[PDB]
């Protein structure tokens, strides 16, 4: 429960990422997991080279699903070429919205 | 990294910035492998040389 999936996509797929949001989160709603934030940090420059690119498109997302929808997005990120890194987390708490992109501008 | 303005200034800004970063004593400890007991002697002798230094200075702080 209460995961904090953060994943970044390819800079050439940042146009297509709007359909990529609901394509993943609709399957979570099939499991029975509500989503408490969905932030899109945008196109930024990395600190180093990840498969010889330098821009990305960060996607922040906090999901509270059961053990099956976690098995979904664990596999779908591995079977993609848009997404280049991911990080699944776990907190034992709830989620408020609008963390830092106000302050990051 | 040191950019540049006379030249003698940027030397001493580079000899010092390398040492204040490090990577000169660490290279010198890559040329012989210490078994982890001998790395527990550095952890033992340096802890004595710090707690005894906090007390020997108090004699100067009398």
């Amino acid at each position: 429960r209460h995961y904090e999936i953060v994943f970044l996509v390819h800079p050439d797929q940042s146009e297509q990422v709007g359909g990529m949001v609901e394509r993943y989160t609709k399957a979570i709603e099939e499991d029975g997991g509500k989503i408490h934030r969905l932030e899109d940090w945008g196109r930024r420059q990395l600190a180093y080279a990840i498969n010889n690119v330098h821009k990305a498109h960060y996607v922040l997302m906090n999901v509270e699903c059961s053990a099956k929808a976690l098995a979904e997005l664990e596999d779908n990120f591995r079977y993609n070429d848009a997404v280049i890194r991911n990080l699944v987390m776990r907190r034992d708490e709830a989620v408020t919205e609008q963390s830092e992109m106000l302050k990051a501008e | 990294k040191v950019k540049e303005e006379p030249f003698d200034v940027a030397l001493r800004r580079f000899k010092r910035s390398c040492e204040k970063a490090g990577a000169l004593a660490e290279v010198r400890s890559r040329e012989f492998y210490e078994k982890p007991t001998a790395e527990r002697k550095r952890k033992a002798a340096a802890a004595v040389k710090r707690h005894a230094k906090k007390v020997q200075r108090e004699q100067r702080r009398r």
Partner: protein, 71 residues
């Protein structure tokens, strides 16, 4: 007393669960080369120094902070 106030950079505020998101905080605790500072220089309490080292290693993984001056 600069090493004294930075202990209160986390304990005077209710910012106990630090995140790997506030890069404006984490750049105060990283040296010019990239390596992480000790805790007798900042003087932070060792509860938070352990908690500070995780948020570096996660932000380093997401390419938000470099490792060395090479890349």
């Amino acid at each position: 007393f600069f090493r004294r106030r930075r202990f209160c950079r986390f304990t005077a505020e209710g910012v106990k669960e630090i995140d790997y998101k506030d890069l404006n905080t984490l750049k105060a605790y990283v040296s010019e080369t990239g390596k992480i500072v000790p805790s007798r220089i900042t003087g932070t309490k060792a509860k938070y120094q352990r908690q500070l080292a995780t948020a570096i290693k996660r932000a380093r993984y997401l390419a938000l902070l470099p490792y060395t001056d090479s890349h």
